[PDB]
Design an enzyme around this catalytic site. Structure first.
Site, PDB file in Angstrom:
ATOM      1  N   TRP A   1      36.274  45.036  52.562  1.00 27.30           N
ATOM      2  CA  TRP A   1      37.530  45.670  52.229  1.00 27.30           C
ATOM      3  C   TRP A   1      37.329  46.455  50.934  1.00 27.30           C
ATOM      4  O   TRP A   1      36.389  46.212  50.181  1.00 27.30           O
ATOM      5  CB  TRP A   1      38.656  44.650  52.091  1.00 27.30           C
ATOM      6  CG  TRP A   1      38.368  43.524  51.161  1.00 27.30           C
ATOM      7  CD1 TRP A   1      38.479  43.534  49.789  1.00 27.30           C
ATOM      8  CD2 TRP A   1      37.951  42.205  51.519  1.00 27.30           C
ATOM      9  NE1 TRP A   1      38.138  42.303  49.283  1.00 27.30           N
ATOM     10  CE2 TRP A   1      37.813  41.471  50.327  1.00 27.30           C
ATOM     11  CE3 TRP A   1      37.676  41.571  52.740  1.00 27.30           C
ATOM     12  CZ2 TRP A   1      37.417  40.136  50.317  1.00 27.30           C
ATOM     13  CZ3 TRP A   1      37.276  40.250  52.725  1.00 27.30           C
ATOM     14  CH2 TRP A   1      37.152  39.543  51.519  1.00 27.30           C
TER      15      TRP A   1
ATOM     16  N   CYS B   1      26.269  45.472  44.533  1.00 28.75           N
ATOM     17  CA  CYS B   1      27.543  45.133  45.172  1.00 28.75           C
ATOM     18  C   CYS B   1      28.373  44.217  44.282  1.00 28.75           C
ATOM     19  O   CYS B   1      27.973  43.082  44.003  1.00 28.75           O
ATOM     20  CB  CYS B   1      27.322  44.468  46.537  1.00 28.75           C
ATOM     21  SG  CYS B   1      28.859  43.885  47.289  1.00 28.75           S
TER      22      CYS B   1
ATOM     23  N   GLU C   1      37.111  53.001  44.763  1.00 34.14           N
ATOM     24  CA  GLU C   1      36.297  53.731  45.731  1.00 34.14           C
ATOM     25  C   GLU C   1      37.090  54.861  46.376  1.00 34.14           C
ATOM     26  O   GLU C   1      36.557  55.955  46.594  1.00 34.14           O
ATOM     27  CB  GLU C   1      35.754  52.791  46.806  1.00 34.14           C
ATOM     28  CG  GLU C   1      34.944  51.619  46.276  1.00 34.14           C
ATOM     29  CD  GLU C   1      34.499  50.666  47.401  1.00 34.14           C
ATOM     30  OE1 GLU C   1      33.477  50.978  48.047  1.00 34.14           O
ATOM     31  OE2 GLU C   1      35.164  49.634  47.630  1.00 34.14           O
TER      32      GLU C   1
ATOM     33  N   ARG D   1      30.238  40.466  45.843  1.00 33.14           N
ATOM     34  CA  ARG D   1      29.381  39.454  46.449  1.00 33.14           C
ATOM     35  C   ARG D   1      29.917  38.032  46.339  1.00 33.14           C
ATOM     36  O   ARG D   1      29.323  37.139  46.939  1.00 33.14           O
ATOM     37  CB  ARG D   1      27.988  39.507  45.839  1.00 33.14           C
ATOM     38  CG  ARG D   1      27.109  40.563  46.478  1.00 33.14           C
ATOM     39  CD  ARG D   1      25.743  40.650  45.776  1.00 33.14           C
ATOM     40  NE  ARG D   1      25.850  41.158  44.414  1.00 33.14           N
ATOM     41  CZ  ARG D   1      24.865  41.113  43.524  1.00 33.14           C
ATOM     42  NH1 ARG D   1      23.714  40.545  43.863  1.00 33.14           N
ATOM     43  NH2 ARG D   1      25.040  41.610  42.291  1.00 33.14           N
TER      44      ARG D   1
END
Ligand code: HEM
Ligand code: HEM
Ligand SMILES: Cc1cc(N)nc(CCc2cc(CC[C@@H]3CCCN3C)cc(F)c2F)c1
Ligand SMILES: Cc1cc(N)nc(CCc2cc(CC[C@@H]3CCCN3C)cc(F)c2F)c1
Ligand SMILES: C[C@H](O)[C@H](O)[C@H]1CNc2nc(N)[nH]c(=O)c2N1
Ligand SMILES: C[C@H](O)[C@H](O)[C@H]1CNc2nc(N)[nH]c(=O)c2N1
Ligand SMILES: [Zn+2]
Lengths: 416, 408
Positions: free
Chosen positions: A285, A113, A290, A116
């Protein structure tokens, strides 16, 4: 044993001692690196009292250390309490403080991720008193409203009851809380999101009346206590969507594209002190790529590069014209422009990767390490002009953790 | 133990058994993956190494367990007991070099592996001789812009005191000088080497694209400076097919990528000087050489000339410029008829090459972190391809920079 990572752009070297607290396995060996395998055996998730108290004890040691109460009478009593509750009842219940800590640290430990830096500002919704799929629908609706916040997105997670004997699982059958349907046509073409064709078919079989458009929000399919899952339509006023337009190309709106604002992963398993929370939707969000790179431009997704390049009138004959790369940038400019114009939280990949580098450096300084999966952290476009490309990273698994689990429709025992 | 790799864009699944032959180590463990670390770390050891190599060689020619096989195994066994080393037959040397390339898990260009031209330079004794072999290599590989793969192999290490080394990292690289006012002129990656060149005798033009001289070390002696003849150094002026101001930037690059500082290992023998060359993938120049912050870093200058909104990162002006720069590189090489491959073509080639290796060899070691191009990653087929990374031999290995080591 200490380990060093080097940033080859800045020559900054960091020292990892945190990997020594690593328990789970990577999947690699001295003779093979499985670093690019998407679902190694180890990242996926049936558990008895035999191994549970050591897992509980380690988590509680970590918890009481973080609150500067290691070895306190509060710490020792809680260990004793958990011990007796395990031997008596074969499992145990987390306190509210422990659940919040666990969920934040699961995110903190998610090595794939890039977002973070935000891990400590997570809203934790305790849904452990939930008993029915209707009750789950209500908890999820409230999560969606709170997290969306009229476009000013807030990170949140909702935690349903933990697994007991694996026969009474709570599961959200949707991979994400909000997703567009995909329909296979008789002529082989796909309408909507090809990634969701199998799930769309399950919903349709379970009685969902499909609009059969290109951007149909899928219904929620919710399993409480191991019963057959049930269909619920998210209230449309709760589903925030953004029409995609381009700031210079007026024909771009005519492509009819939109996307939802809230990325909310709902099919992963949350592990805390050896307890398995099989239904734990979480949301943040979007990073722009992506949507603009993967959702729109993956050959196996909406796959709009062709039509976008066609309308840009690029040289589409040879690939050496980089018409594919040219259209990808424009599409990603449009996603970012549309979200910011509508005041819906989004982050570009340059901002997000710079933040993660600062996060990671801070984590080495205050925590002794930051587990990071380079294969996933580097953005899917323009890799080397983001500072993570040049960052060496160590990947290892800490608990609490988010894990993969098999799709429920492949394991579920149907009641009828 | 018989492993599977899935391509997620095509659902194609390949079964890897080749990794069972892996010999060296990866740096990872079950507790930690070092997949993104740039450079992880006697008579007795030598014969098993030779045997393993001769075993795979005589298998490849379908003479495993033949008279000639055992005879050769015997003869090399004798040579090692006697001389504490041995020499490769020409055919074995060619096989070993081709397979070191075949085994280079970080190389996307390996579909071409079997067409390597091998120049045996083991009779070389002096740096002047090295210079001659290298000029011949450069001319052969350049081939008026119709580039051909080639490797030149200098004498193998003996006692570590008589090492042949090329001190340049690439046969052809641009110089880099620190400016008194702070910044860096030319190629910043080559500042220390450009130092040691001047600091050993070179007379620098102190320009921006000055071809560095060769620094050649034979038999462990002090290295010697040699200028590659300019007529052998093919260069491409960089222009854009749409922006006429692009030519004004004054950019050029060389056509021949030629790695010269690696170590080639075959059957336990170490070839410390083994320059090899192929042809560029377009992103190597345009993404890395031109746009890396630690390199020529022309992004801000190009974006200004395009009049993009550089106020906020979210306008993606770096991405837009990055694409144009790389369009120009490809356009310029193609216009000058110099071989180059774009990252879409090369990664599609590599997928085809993986399918070939899994089918005809049982697998193909591959380092995803290096195979995926540094731009537009997920729109190339290698992004969605799982890859198993493992170390086979013969191999190319990294080695310490000579100036840190040379007993002067
Ligand atoms: C708030 C802003 C956030 C951003 C910008 C962000 C971004 C990302 C991105 C880009 C990925 C790569 C996955 C992909 O490409 O599909 C990822 C992975 C992941 N994120 Fe975050 N995320 C955010 C919040 C969160 C939160 C709130 C959680 C959990 C509480 C979380 C947990 C994870 C996990 C577990 C993965 C790993 C998925 C896997 O292992 O396959 N993220 N994130
Ligand atoms: C013919 C066309 C070739 C192409 C298009 C190509 C492409 C590439 C690229 C893009 C890389 C990534 C490294 C970087 O980004 O700096 C690479 C690495 C590498 N190439 Fe190839 N290459 C070619 C020929 C060759 C040949 C002829 C050899 C040797 C005989 C070779 C051996 C290697 C090795 C050993 C590495 C990785 C070094 C390491 O482990 O760090 N390549 N190549
Ligand atoms: C909270 C949040 C914020 C944000 N910005 N993005 C996300 C999505 C990231 C994401 C993806 C996936 C699956 C990717 C699937 C499976 C393999 C490849 N792909 C098809 C699982 C996750 F747990 C996850 F967190 C979540
Ligand atoms: C023959 C050929 C064809 C082609 N197209 N490209 C190349 C160059 C790729 C390349 C690079 C490096 C070092 C990369 C350095 C060291 C650390 C990080 N980086 C700065 C070593 C190689 F063996 C290599 F092959 C060679
Ligand atoms: C830290 C990371 O390992 C480093 O930036 C690597 C990443 N991948 C790469 N990939 C290629 N092809 N070339 C490189 O130099 C690098 N550098
Ligand atoms: C095979 C490969 O591991 C797979 O395509 C991965 C690579 N890196 C990724 N990185 C992110 N962020 N998301 C992904 O889906 C993937 N997919
Ligand atoms: Zn690994």
């Amino acid at each position: 044993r200490f380990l060093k990572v080097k940033n080859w752009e800045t020559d900054v070297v960091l020292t990892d001692t945190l990997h020594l607290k690593s328990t789970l396995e990577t999947g690699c060996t001295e003779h093979i690196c499985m670093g690019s395998i998407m679902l190694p055996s180890q990242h996926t998730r049936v558990r008895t009292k035999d191994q549970l108290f050591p897992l509980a004890k380690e988590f509680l040691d970590q918890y009481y250390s973080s609150i500067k109460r290691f070895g306190s009478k509060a710490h020792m009593d809680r260990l004793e309490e958990v011990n007796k509750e395990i031997e008596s009842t074969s499992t145990y219940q987390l306190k509210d403080t422990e659940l919040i800590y666990g969920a934040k640290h699961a995110w903190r430990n998610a090595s794939r991720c890039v977002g973070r830096i935000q891990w400590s500002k997570l809203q934790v919704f305790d849904a452990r008193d939930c008993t029915t799929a209707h009750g789950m629908f209500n908890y999820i609706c409230n999560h969606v409203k709170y997290a969306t916040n009229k476009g000013n997105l807030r990170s949140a997670i909702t935690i349903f009851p933990q697994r007991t004997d694996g026969k009474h699982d709570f599961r959200v059958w949707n991979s994400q809380l909000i997703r567009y349907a995909g329909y296979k046509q008789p002529d082989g073409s796909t309408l909507g999101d090809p990634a969701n064709v199998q799930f769309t078919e399950i919903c349709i079989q379970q009685g969902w009346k499909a609009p059969r458009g290109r951007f149909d929000v899928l219904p929620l399919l919710l399993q409480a206590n191991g019963n057959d899952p049930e269909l619920f339509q998210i209230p449309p006023e709760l589903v925030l969507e953004v029409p995609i337009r381009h700031p210079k190309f007026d024909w771009f709106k005519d492509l009819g594209l939109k996307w939802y604002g809230l990325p909310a992963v709902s099919n992963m398993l949350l592990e805390i002190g050896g307890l398995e929370f099989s239904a734990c939707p979480f949301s943040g969000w979007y990073m722009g790529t992506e949507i603009g790179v993967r959702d729109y431009c993956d050959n196996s997704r909406y796959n709009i590069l062709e039509e976008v390049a066609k309308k840009m009138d690029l040289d589409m004959r040879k690939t050496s014209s980089l018409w594919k790369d040219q259209a990808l940038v424009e599409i990603n400019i449009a996603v970012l422009y549309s979200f910011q114009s509508d005041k819906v939280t989004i982050v570009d990949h340059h901002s997000a990767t710079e933040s993660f580098i600062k996060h990671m450096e801070n984590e080495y300084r205050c925590r002794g390490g930051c587990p990071a999966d380079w294969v996933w952290i580097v953005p899917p476009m323009s890799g080397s002009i983001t500072p993570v490309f040049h960052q060496e990273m160590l990947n290892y698994r800490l608990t609490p953790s988010f894990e993969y689990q098999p799709d429920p429709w492949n394991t579920h025992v149907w009641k009828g």
